[PDB]
Enzyme design. Structure first.
Site, PDB file in Angstrom:
ATOM      1  N   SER A 183       0.829  -1.199   0.000  1.00 10.93           N
ATOM      2  CA  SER A 183       0.000   0.000   0.000  1.00 10.93           C
ATOM      3  C   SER A 183       0.867   1.255   0.000  1.00 10.93           C
ATOM      4  O   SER A 183       0.394   2.350  -0.304  1.00 10.93           O
ATOM      5  CB  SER A 183      -0.941   0.010   1.206  1.00 10.93           C
ATOM      6  OG  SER A 183      -0.228   0.238   2.408  1.00 10.93           O
ATOM      7  N   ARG A 184       2.142   1.087   0.338  1.00 12.35           N
ATOM      8  CA  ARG A 184       3.085   2.201   0.347  1.00 12.35           C
ATOM      9  C   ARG A 184       3.415   2.673  -1.064  1.00 12.35           C
ATOM     10  O   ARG A 184       2.754   2.294  -2.032  1.00 12.35           O
ATOM     11  CB  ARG A 184       4.376   1.813   1.071  1.00 12.35           C
ATOM     12  CG  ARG A 184       4.348   2.006   2.579  1.00 12.35           C
ATOM     13  CD  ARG A 184       4.096   0.701   3.316  1.00 12.35           C
ATOM     14  NE  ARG A 184       4.623   0.751   4.677  1.00 12.35           N
ATOM     15  CZ  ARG A 184       4.542  -0.246   5.552  1.00 12.35           C
ATOM     16  NH1 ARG A 184       3.949  -1.383   5.216  1.00 12.35           N
ATOM     17  NH2 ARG A 184       5.055  -0.105   6.767  1.00 12.35           N
ATOM     18  N   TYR A 240      19.199   3.812  10.108  1.00  9.64           N
ATOM     19  CA  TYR A 240      18.574   3.338   8.877  1.00  9.64           C
ATOM     20  C   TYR A 240      19.598   2.647   7.987  1.00  9.64           C
ATOM     21  O   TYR A 240      19.261   1.756   7.208  1.00  9.64           O
ATOM     22  CB  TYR A 240      17.917   4.499   8.125  1.00  9.64           C
ATOM     23  CG  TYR A 240      17.236   4.097   6.835  1.00  9.64           C
ATOM     24  CD1 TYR A 240      15.956   3.558   6.844  1.00  9.64           C
ATOM     25  CD2 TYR A 240      17.869   4.262   5.610  1.00  9.64           C
ATOM     26  CE1 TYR A 240      15.327   3.190   5.669  1.00  9.64           C
ATOM     27  CE2 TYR A 240      17.247   3.896   4.429  1.00  9.64           C
ATOM     28  CZ  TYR A 240      15.976   3.362   4.465  1.00  9.64           C
ATOM     29  OH  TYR A 240      15.349   2.995   3.296  1.00  9.64           O
TER      30      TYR A 240
END
Ligand SMILES: NC(=O)c1ccc[n+]([C@@H]2O[C@H](COP(=O)([O-])OP(=O)(O)OC[C@H]3O[C@@H](n4cnc5c(N)ncnc54)[C@H](O)[C@@H]3O)[C@@H](O)[C@H]2O)c1
Ligand SMILES: NC(=O)c1ccc[n+]([C@@H]2O[C@H](COP(=O)([O-])OP(=O)(O)OC[C@H]3O[C@@H](n4cnc5c(N)ncnc54)[C@H](O)[C@@H]3O)[C@@H](O)[C@H]2O)c1
Lengths: 242, 212, 231, 244
Positions: free
Chosen positions: C16-17, C147
């Site tokens: 959905s991203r 990250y």
């Protein structure tokens, strides 16, 4: 302090006339290593010797030529009665030009000296050490440009990148013969204005490296402390293109 | 030197003493013959309880992360309990260390990774994900702190043992046999004492990197 | 793809991203029976409708991945294509709560996902997995220390998993996006060779390419427009 | 009438192996392939498998490289939007026994040849303001090296740094430069390898078999297409897991 870990080492440094090549000769001779200076200019190489106890000697040989490369090793073994256990190739030049306008002369000149020159020296040195059953450590200088590429340096990047692949192959074949082969990746070193200032800000540390710092890793790779490091590329870029 | 009681940790401590041991199990035996504590890599509060002991004792120029656990096993056989363990020890453990050491140094840090963290290995899925994470982590930390006169690096050793074949996995290695902890320690002290070198992953290889 | 039985079933975590949608949309026009799955069921249901299925899952929790995997398998069949595009993004500033969080959904989330996939891919002796990483995972970037570790360990993990299961005819690849328009910049784009940020579908084509290359495994395909040459 | 409908493909060394497989793959995408090769007899053989045209040129020569782009651009009335360099040779010998001839041969063809082709193609695209993709076929040997291939590794490693450089300069013009690093592929070049050694390598490869020249052509077809419009200055590996 706790130096002289190369007291019984015969060091052969090509392109030791100025810049990094000269700085390496100082670092090695500082650790009691008999340095065999080699450069295109005899006067420049002999000047470096004067800046160094171990009865050193300078030699003139075009590393690009196969004859001068083989004659180089024969003269070293005839002057010191032994092949150089430490071989560092610093002989290289830069002839920058846009890819769309780079002449064949700009290409051939860089390839012959940087890549082919390194090949002939590394080969002749390997043939010398193996034939005498001697163990050694071959070091080749390959800029960080020859890993990521740089604008205007198509011939230089390809030559330095080729040196890495050249060394990684040699390290695999000469591994059985106890001959370690490594590569060094320097950043931008202040060696013989507006473009330089922009390069410093790009470097994470914020300044150009010194030819002495490039001779630091060389002194390590050629020593017994780095006896299990072969086929490895070392970066001295100050964080540039890490 | 974190995890300086056994493995390459003690080797780094010995070579550095020749020129503050932090291990899980008290670790004093190494201090009985070295110049210049207990902590686990998983718990951050325990890490803080160790860095606080540094101010009273010495008051942290060099930091070496050599603590880690390596248990082989297939991905389908490996359970979540050990997946989190090695990650919080080999990866997060080094992340919490460099963070608390960032209070001072305003420095040189060397994280002991592995060759399998870059190229991978069979049966070592989690360990490769652990030693491989500190690679990019050091890269990002370097770019951010290089201007602060602080430099972080990574050592990626190949097969470290007492030349234990495998069998016979030494014939594939171009440089005779396996490497020893002392030889790897010479690379750690090198990167720590080498200016203009940051964010670099030095590989104590032996020709192993050329293959799988 | 196929001509009858949709034997090409793909599971795109975080479908959905941004990156997830471009992949789920591109493979849908190729003949792949996909399954848009994310943390938001409503965001996955709409994506599926705009046949295909939709699932709700959290890659951080282990029992939630194993639950969804069995739920996914029973409604579509055995999955032989996996796409992990559900990742989230200072010194002495980041709390430990944030570290463990994105080290579980980015790194461990893909590990637990690949683990559940090997229980059906090894038996069928076929499959292909692509993990979404970054150049930041390898080259690093200022301000993105944590990250970098997440996408960095994903590189070593996939390659380790690649050599482990390659003899089962199963490929595990990695994509390394640079700068993308998803959910200062002009001076940075000036340094970038192409001179622009990457589009979402441009990353999707790179993912599908690795899903369809029958001799590429454990390779990190970087899509950055030459960004890895300037930083 | 497909993916690469409007594309004009220039493939050097398209008379055999990968170069021939690339020509077939790109032509299947609706592209008119300009098969270039040192041997014209093998070049025409490729065209008959695929309007297409064959060209004879030695990439190691500067005269034959410039004229090649001159002959092609004047035959199709347009510059090649796709440039695939597959022209390569193998003169393998141990480092201690490798002659100077064994060195210069591979370097001039694989390294220098790639340069001249990439350069002249870049000059042809910019002169007409045309965008395109330059695909240079390197090798996994160009990253880790290989026994007996001191001159081959030095040439393949040089291709990487060469292509990455070109990608930084031709990025503003709209020309993407990429590198391909294939493993041991089922090609006539690997037919020079003893069968007992091929089986040994087959064991080393994680997937457990040699690659097909179409699999390499699949990568080339992707890099030439607009599906990789944001992909430049990279190195795609088709090794089947080997030397990862
Ligand atoms: N800042 C930099 O220039 C820089 C940065 C990174 C790496 N490097 C590399 O490190 C090496 C050392 O660079 P430097 O700072 O000494 O550059 P330099 O300009 O100081 O080197 C010039 C020297 O190289 C010698 N030389 C050149 N070609 C030769 C040949 N064919 N035969 C014999 N001698 C030859 C010349 O005699 C001259 O004395 C170079 O090869 C370079 O490619 C340089
Ligand atoms: N085949 C492999 O296993 C493999 C693996 C990695 C990389 N590569 C690289 O991929 C490329 C394709 O190789 P291949 O598998 O087709 O090998 P191949 O032996 O099938 O290719 C030989 C072809 O190259 C042409 N050629 C050679 N020198 C030339 C020159 N100077 N000018 C023009 N044409 C020339 C010949 O005419 C011949 O048709 C090669 O450059 C090789 O270096 C191949």
């Amino acid at each position: 302090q706790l130096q002289n870990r190369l007291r019984s080492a015969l060091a052969l440094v090509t392109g030791a006339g100025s810049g990094i090549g000269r700085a390496v000769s100082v670092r090695l001779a500082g650790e009691g290593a008999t340095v065999a200076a080699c450069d295109l200019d005899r006067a420049a190489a002999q000047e470096t010797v004067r800046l160094l106890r171990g009865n050193h000697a300078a030699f003139q040989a075009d590393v690009s030529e196969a004859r001068a490369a083989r004659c180089l090793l024969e003269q070293v073994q005839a002057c010191f009665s032994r092949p150089p256990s430490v071989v560092v190739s610093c002989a290289g030049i830069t002839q920058d030009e846009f890819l769309l306008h780079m002449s064949e002369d700009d290409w051939d000149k860089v390839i012959a000296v940087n890549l082919k020159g390194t090949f002939l020296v590394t080969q002749a040195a390997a043939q010398a050490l193996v034939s005498n059953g001697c163990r050694g450590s071959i070091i080749n200088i390959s800029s960080i440009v020859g890993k990521v590429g740089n604008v205007g340096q198509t011939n230089y990047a390809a030559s330095k990148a080729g040196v890495i692949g050249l060394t990684q192959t040699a390290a695999r074949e000469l591994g059985r013969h106890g001959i370690r082969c490594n590569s060094v990746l320097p950043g931008f070193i202040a060696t013989p204005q507006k473009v330089v200032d922009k390069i410093t800000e790009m470097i994470p540390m914020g300044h150009l490296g010194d030819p002495e710092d490039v001779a630091d890793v060389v002194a390590f790779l050629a020593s017994e402390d780095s006896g299990y490091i072969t086929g490895t590329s070392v970066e001295v870029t100050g964080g540039l293109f890490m | 030197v974190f995890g300086g009681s056994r493995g390459i940790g003690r080797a780094v401590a010995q070579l550095m003493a020749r020129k503050a041991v932090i291990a899980r199990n008290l670790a004093k035996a190494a201090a009985g013959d070295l110049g210049g504590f207990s902590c686990d890599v998983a718990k951050e509060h325990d890490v803080q309880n160790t860095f606080e002991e540094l101010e009273k004792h010495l008051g942290v120029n060099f930091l070496v992360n050599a603590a880690g656990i390596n248990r082989d096993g297939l991905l389908v056989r490996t359970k979540t309990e050990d997946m989190v363990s090695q990650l919080h020890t080999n990866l997060l453990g080094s992340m919490l260390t460099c963070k608390a050491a960032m209070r001072t140094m305003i420095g040189s840090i060397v994280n002991v990774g592995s060759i399998v963290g870059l190229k991978g290995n069979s049966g070592q899925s989690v360990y490769s994900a652990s030693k491989g994470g500190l690679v990019g982590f050091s890269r990002a930390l370097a770019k951010e702190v290089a201007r602060k006169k602080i430099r972080v690096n990574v050592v990626a050793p190949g097969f470290v043992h007492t030349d234990m074949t495998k069998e016979h996995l030494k014939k594939n290695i171009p440089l005779g046999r396996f490497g020893e902890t002392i030889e790897v320690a010479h690379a750690v002290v090198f990167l720590l004492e080498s200016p203009y070198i940051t964010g670099h992953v030095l590989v104590v290889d032996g020709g192993l990197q050329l293959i799988l």
